C-alpha cells in the first residue's frame, strides 16, 4: 500500500497511536531504542522492551500493530488515564523510561541530544539593580493559541515580558518587595522540536473546558533564529515540518499526518489505515476555522540535522538477540 503499517485501535488510547508513529519515524531514536540492553528485562513489566516490540512490529509486520503490552507496561489502565493526561506527559513517560534504561549504556544521552534545548528564565526589577537568571532545560514547548494568528505570534507571546507590579510584586529579599519583569529567552533549539498547541482552556460558569477551534497557522518551514539570544551561522534555526498530530471533535478522533522521509511526501495515519495525502490536507486543512478538526501537536526537525535524525533504518540494525526474543514471543502467540 504505502510501505508503512498502522496501529490497531484497542481502547481509549487517544493520542497514543499518533505519538507512536511520530516516535517511530524518529529514526535515530528508533535505532537507539533497538540497542537497549533489555535481555534480562521482564516482558510484561519493561517499558523499553514493549517499545522495542512495537517498533519492530511497525517496521516488519504487514498487519496492524497492537499496543496492549505497551499500555500495560507503563500502567495506564484507569478509565480517565488517557483523558486525564496530555501528549507531552505520555511522551515524557516513554522517553524518561527509555533514557533511564539507557543510563550506563553505549547509547546513553540520545534523548537529550535529540529533544533537549536550553532556555533562560530571567527576573529583573526596574527600581533596584538585581537580576536572577535561572537556567532551565526543556524537552517540549506548549504554545498558546487563543488570540494568536500563527506560530510566530505564539512564540512572541512565549518570550513576552510579564510585568510584576503592585499586589503581585517580586520579593527581592534584601531589596524588599519590588516591581519587576519576568521573561524567557531561548538559548538553543533541539534537533527535534516538539511543539504542543493549547486548544483547551478552562471556562467558569460553563462546561469547564471549551475546545478552541480557532484558526491557527503553522508553516512548513519555521525560522526561529530571531528568538535566540545569540545565533550561529552555518547552523541557523530553520526547521522543517515533520509531524502534525490532529484531533477532531470536542471535549474525539486522533490522526497523525507525517512525511517520514522529510521529502514532502505526506501520509495520513488513521490507526490501522495509512494512506497518501496532499500537503494541503496535512498543513492547510488543519489550521482550524468555522470545523472541529485542528492540529494539537507539531513536530519540527532542524534542517541541519535532518539526515542524521532520519537515518535510513535497515532490518539489520535490530540486534539479532532482540529479534530472536521477539520471534520467540511471536511463536508462543502463534501456538
Amino acid at each position: 500500500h504505502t510501505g508503512y503499517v498502522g496501529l490497531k485501535n484497542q481502547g481509549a488510547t487517544c493520542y497514543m497511536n499518533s505519538l507512536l508513529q511520530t516516535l517511530f519515524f524518529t529514526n535515530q531514536l528508533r535505532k537507539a531504542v533497538y540497542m537497549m540492553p533489555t535481555e534480562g528485562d521482564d516482558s510484561s513489566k519493561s517499558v523499553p522492551l514493549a517499545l522495542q516490540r512495537v517498533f519492530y512490529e511497525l517496521q516488519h509486520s504487514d498487519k496492524p500493530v497492537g499496543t496492549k503490552k505497551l499500555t500495560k507496561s507503563f500502567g495506564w489502565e484507569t478509565l480517565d488515564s488517557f483523558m486525564q493526561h496530555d501528549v507531552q506527559e505520555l511522551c515524557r513517560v516513554l522517553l524518561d523510561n527509555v533514557e533511564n534504561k539507557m543510563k550506563g549504556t553505549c547509547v546513553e544521552g540520545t534523548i537529550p541530544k535529540l529533544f533537549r534545548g536550553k532556555m533562560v528564565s530571567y527576573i529583573q526589577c526596574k527600581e533596584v539593580d538585581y537580576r536572577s537568571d535561572r537556567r532551565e532545560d526543556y524537552y517540549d514547548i506548549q504554545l498558546s493559541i487563543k488570540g494568536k494568528k500563527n506560530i510566530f505570534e505564539s512564540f512572541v507571546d512565549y518570550v513576552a515580558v510579564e510585568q510584576l507590579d503592585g499586589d503581585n510584586k517580586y520579593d527581592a529579599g534584601e531589596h524588599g518587595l519590588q516591581e519587576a519583569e519576568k521573561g524567557v529567552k531561548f538559548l538553543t533549539l533541539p534537533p527535534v522540536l516538539h511543539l504542543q498547541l493549547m486548544r483547551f482552556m478552562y471556562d467558569p460558569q460553563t462546561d469547564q473546558n471549551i475546545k478552541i477551534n480557532d484558526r491557527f497557522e503553522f508553516p512548513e518551514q519555521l525560522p526561529l533564529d530571531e528568538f535566540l539570544q545569540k545565533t550561529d551561522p552555518k547552523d541557523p534555526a530553520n526547521y522543517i515540518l515533520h509531524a502534525v498530530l490532529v484531533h477532531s471533535g470536542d471535549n474525539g478522533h486522533y490522526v497523525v499526518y507525517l512525511n517520514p522521509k522529510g521529502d514532502g511526501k505526506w501520509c495520513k495515519f488513521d490507526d490501522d489505515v495509512v494512506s497518501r495525502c496532499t500537503k494541503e490536507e496535512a498543513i492547510e486543512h488543519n489550521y482550524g476555522g468555522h470545523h472541529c478538526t485542528n492540529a494539537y501537536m507539531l513536530v519540527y526537525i532542524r534542517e541541519s540535522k535532518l539526515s542524521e535524525v532520519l537515518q535510513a533504518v535497515t532490518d539489520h540494525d535490530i540486534p539479532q538477540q532482540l529479534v530472536e526474543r521477539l520471534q520467540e514471543e511471536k511463536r508462543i502467540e502463534a501456538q
Binding site: 486525564q84 493526561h85 496530555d86 493549547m198 486548544r199 469547564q208 475546545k211 471535549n251
Partner: peptide, 10 residues
Amino acid sequence: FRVNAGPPRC
C-alpha cells in the same frame, strides 16, 4: 489552558 481534551486542569 490544555492541549488535549479531558477533565479541567486549572
